[PDB]
Scaffold this active site. Structure first.
Site, PDB file in Angstrom:
ATOM      1  N   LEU A   1      -1.426  10.690  13.601  1.00 38.08           N
ATOM      2  CA  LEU A   1      -0.970   9.348  14.035  1.00 38.08           C
ATOM      3  C   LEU A   1      -0.188   9.349  15.316  1.00 38.08           C
ATOM      4  O   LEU A   1       0.142   8.272  15.849  1.00 38.08           O
ATOM      5  CB  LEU A   1      -0.081   8.743  12.954  1.00 38.08           C
ATOM      6  CG  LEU A   1      -0.820   8.562  11.603  1.00 38.08           C
ATOM      7  CD1 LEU A   1       0.049   7.798  10.686  1.00 38.08           C
ATOM      8  CD2 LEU A   1      -2.131   7.841  11.789  1.00 38.08           C
TER       9      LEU A   1
ATOM     10  N   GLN B   1       3.467   1.598   2.862  1.00 37.87           N
ATOM     11  CA  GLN B   1       3.299   0.527   3.836  1.00 37.87           C
ATOM     12  C   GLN B   1       3.739  -0.885   3.296  1.00 37.87           C
ATOM     13  O   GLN B   1       3.401  -1.269   2.182  1.00 37.87           O
ATOM     14  CB  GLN B   1       1.826   0.555   4.324  1.00 37.87           C
ATOM     15  CG  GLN B   1       1.548  -0.363   5.491  1.00 37.87           C
ATOM     16  CD  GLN B   1       0.132  -0.222   6.085  1.00 37.87           C
ATOM     17  OE1 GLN B   1      -0.478   0.829   6.035  1.00 37.87           O
ATOM     18  NE2 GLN B   1      -0.365  -1.320   6.692  1.00 37.87           N
TER      19      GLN B   1
ATOM     20  N   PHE C   1       1.454  10.660   1.422  1.00 34.23           N
ATOM     21  CA  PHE C   1       1.053  10.110   2.724  1.00 34.23           C
ATOM     22  C   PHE C   1       2.137   9.142   3.204  1.00 34.23           C
ATOM     23  O   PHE C   1       2.931   9.485   4.089  1.00 34.23           O
ATOM     24  CB  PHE C   1      -0.367   9.530   2.649  1.00 34.23           C
ATOM     25  CG  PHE C   1      -0.879   8.948   3.944  1.00 34.23           C
ATOM     26  CD1 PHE C   1      -0.346   9.313   5.197  1.00 34.23           C
ATOM     27  CD2 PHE C   1      -1.946   8.048   3.919  1.00 34.23           C
ATOM     28  CE1 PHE C   1      -0.839   8.738   6.383  1.00 34.23           C
ATOM     29  CE2 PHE C   1      -2.442   7.487   5.085  1.00 34.23           C
ATOM     30  CZ  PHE C   1      -1.898   7.829   6.311  1.00 34.23           C
TER      31      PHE C   1
ATOM     32  N   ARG D   1       0.809  -1.205   0.000  1.00 39.70           N
ATOM     33  CA  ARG D   1       0.000   0.000   0.000  1.00 39.70           C
ATOM     34  C   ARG D   1       0.843   1.256   0.000  1.00 39.70           C
ATOM     35  O   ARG D   1       1.565   1.546   0.953  1.00 39.70           O
ATOM     36  CB  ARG D   1      -0.945   0.007   1.205  1.00 39.70           C
ATOM     37  CG  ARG D   1      -1.838   1.234   1.286  1.00 39.70           C
ATOM     38  CD  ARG D   1      -3.003   1.007   2.235  1.00 39.70           C
ATOM     39  NE  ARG D   1      -2.655   1.330   3.615  1.00 39.70           N
ATOM     40  CZ  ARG D   1      -3.164   2.353   4.294  1.00 39.70           C
ATOM     41  NH1 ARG D   1      -4.047   3.158   3.721  1.00 39.70           N
ATOM     42  NH2 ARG D   1      -2.789   2.572   5.547  1.00 39.70           N
TER      43      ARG D   1
ATOM     44  N   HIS E   1       0.414   5.311  16.605  1.00 39.42           N
ATOM     45  CA  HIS E   1       1.338   4.438  15.969  1.00 39.42           C
ATOM     46  C   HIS E   1       2.713   4.724  16.600  1.00 39.42           C
ATOM     47  O   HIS E   1       3.056   5.917  16.826  1.00 39.42           O
ATOM     48  CB  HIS E   1       1.353   4.671  14.451  1.00 39.42           C
ATOM     49  CG  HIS E   1       0.043   4.312  13.796  1.00 39.42           C
ATOM     50  ND1 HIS E   1      -0.178   3.083  13.242  1.00 39.42           N
ATOM     51  CD2 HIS E   1      -1.145   4.957  13.761  1.00 39.42           C
ATOM     52  CE1 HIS E   1      -1.444   3.000  12.834  1.00 39.42           C
ATOM     53  NE2 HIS E   1      -2.042   4.136  13.101  1.00 39.42           N
TER      54      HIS E   1
ATOM     55  N   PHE F   1       5.282   1.428   8.158  1.00 38.39           N
ATOM     56  CA  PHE F   1       5.130   2.375   7.092  1.00 38.39           C
ATOM     57  C   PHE F   1       6.194   3.417   7.149  1.00 38.39           C
ATOM     58  O   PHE F   1       6.707   3.728   8.256  1.00 38.39           O
ATOM     59  CB  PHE F   1       3.729   2.991   7.061  1.00 38.39           C
ATOM     60  CG  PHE F   1       3.340   3.792   8.287  1.00 38.39           C
ATOM     61  CD1 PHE F   1       2.795   3.182   9.404  1.00 38.39           C
ATOM     62  CD2 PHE F   1       3.435   5.178   8.285  1.00 38.39           C
ATOM     63  CE1 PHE F   1       2.382   3.905  10.512  1.00 38.39           C
ATOM     64  CE2 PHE F   1       3.076   5.922   9.443  1.00 38.39           C
ATOM     65  CZ  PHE F   1       2.513   5.302  10.535  1.00 38.39           C
TER      66      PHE F   1
ATOM     67  N   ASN G   1      -0.870  -0.837  12.569  1.00 39.64           N
ATOM     68  CA  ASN G   1      -1.520  -1.667  13.578  1.00 39.64           C
ATOM     69  C   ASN G   1      -3.018  -1.698  13.361  1.00 39.64           C
ATOM     70  O   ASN G   1      -3.530  -0.976  12.508  1.00 39.64           O
ATOM     71  CB  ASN G   1      -1.252  -1.182  15.036  1.00 39.64           C
ATOM     72  CG  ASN G   1      -1.761   0.249  15.312  1.00 39.64           C
ATOM     73  OD1 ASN G   1      -2.947   0.595  15.078  1.00 39.64           O
ATOM     74  ND2 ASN G   1      -0.865   1.082  15.861  1.00 39.64           N
TER      75      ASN G   1
HETATM   76  C1  F0T Z   1      -0.665   4.411   8.111  1.00 38.25           C
HETATM   77  C2  F0T Z   1      -0.706   3.143   8.950  1.00 38.25           C
HETATM   78  O1  F0T Z   1      -2.049   2.687   8.805  1.00 38.25           O
HETATM   79  C3  F0T Z   1      -2.472   1.660   9.544  1.00 38.25           C
HETATM   80  O2  F0T Z   1      -1.761   0.972  10.278  1.00 38.25           O
HETATM   81  C4  F0T Z   1      -3.976   1.440   9.344  1.00 38.25           C
HETATM   82  N1  F0T Z   1      -4.374   0.061   9.629  1.00 38.25           N
HETATM   83  C5  F0T Z   1      -3.895  -0.998   8.901  1.00 38.25           C
HETATM   84  O3  F0T Z   1      -3.087  -0.868   7.969  1.00 38.25           O
HETATM   85  N2  F0T Z   1      -4.343  -2.233   9.258  1.00 38.25           N
HETATM   86  C6  F0T Z   1      -3.771  -3.487   8.724  1.00 38.25           C
HETATM   87  C7  F0T Z   1      -2.899  -4.228   9.719  1.00 38.25           C
HETATM   88  C8  F0T Z   1      -3.135  -5.543  10.135  1.00 38.25           C
HETATM   89  C9  F0T Z   1      -2.289  -6.134  11.078  1.00 38.25           C
HETATM   90  C10 F0T Z   1      -1.164  -5.418  11.572  1.00 38.25           C
HETATM   91  N3  F0T Z   1      -0.277  -5.917  12.462  1.00 38.25           N
HETATM   92  C11 F0T Z   1      -0.955  -4.132  11.120  1.00 38.25           C
HETATM   93  C12 F0T Z   1      -1.820  -3.546  10.204  1.00 38.25           C
HETATM   94  C13 F0T Z   1      -5.441  -2.427  10.241  1.00 38.25           C
HETATM   95  C14 F0T Z   1      -6.732  -2.961   9.594  1.00 38.25           C
HETATM   96  C15 F0T Z   1      -8.093  -2.346   9.900  1.00 38.25           C
HETATM   97  C16 F0T Z   1      -7.769  -3.735  10.427  1.00 38.25           C
END
Ligand code: F0T
Length: 165
Positions: free
Chosen positions: A122, A63, A60, A55, A126, A113, A102
């Site tokens: 954030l 990831q 931004f 991603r 985070h 990321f 997370n």
């Molecule tokens: C800019 C950073 O953005 C995030 O971490 C946003 N959340 C994710 O990317 N996730 C994916 C994810 C899954 C497991 C782990 N350990 C980390 C991220 C969470 C999803 C909604 C359930």
């Protein structure tokens, strides 16, 4: 004493792009730094090598780190599946910040990321554990393969990774 340094060698559909190196703030977030360090060397028998940046959103963040499901739903830490938020001493100040992705409080695994902008909202949510040391130009090159919704137009991988002096 000294903060460890790790590198990713990035490829774009198989084609070498360049190297990004990172300072890991072991002095401030040792548990979180140690996870990413270990996953970069692969010394526990799993980690980041061959995984992708699933991603990427220009202006931004980039990831990655999902080496078990390859799409943002997976990954795991060197401590078990998930681990706690260590602290929120460090902030998302600008491009180059390295921070843990997370799914809620205390759900850190392997996904991470790299900020390509300031992402202050954030802060406190985070865990920030490092920053790009060399090869911010390579991160900006990567960023150009992302899109508004984060799907990449080419496959961005960590062709190799490890620890540097
Ligand atoms: C800019 C950073 O953005 C995030 O971490 C946003 N959340 C994710 O990317 N996730 C994916 C994810 C899954 C497991 C782990 N350990 C980390 C991220 C969470 C999803 C909604 C359930």
């Amino acid at each position: 004493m000294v903060n460890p340094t790790v590198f990713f060698d990035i490829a774009v559909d198989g084609e070498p792009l360049g190297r990004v190196s990172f300072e890991l703030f072991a002095d401030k977030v040792p548990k979180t730094a140690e996870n990413f360090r270990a996953l970069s060397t692969g010394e526990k028998g799993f980690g980041y090598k061959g995984s992708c940046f699933h991603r990427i959103i220009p202006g931004f963040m980039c990831q990655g780190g999902d080496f078990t499901r390859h799409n943002g739903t997976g990954g795991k830490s060197i401590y078990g599946e998930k681990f706690e938020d260590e602290n929120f001493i460090l902030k998302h100040t600008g491009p180059g910040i390295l921070s843990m992705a997370n799914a809620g409080p205390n759900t850190n695994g392997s996904q991470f990321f790299i900020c390509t902008a300031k992402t202050e909202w954030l802060d406190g949510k985070h865990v920030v554990f490092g920053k790009v040391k060399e090869g911010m130009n390579i991160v900006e090159a990567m960023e150009r393969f992302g899109s508004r919704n984060g799907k990449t137009s080419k496959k961005i991988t960590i062709a190799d990774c490890g620890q540097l002096e």
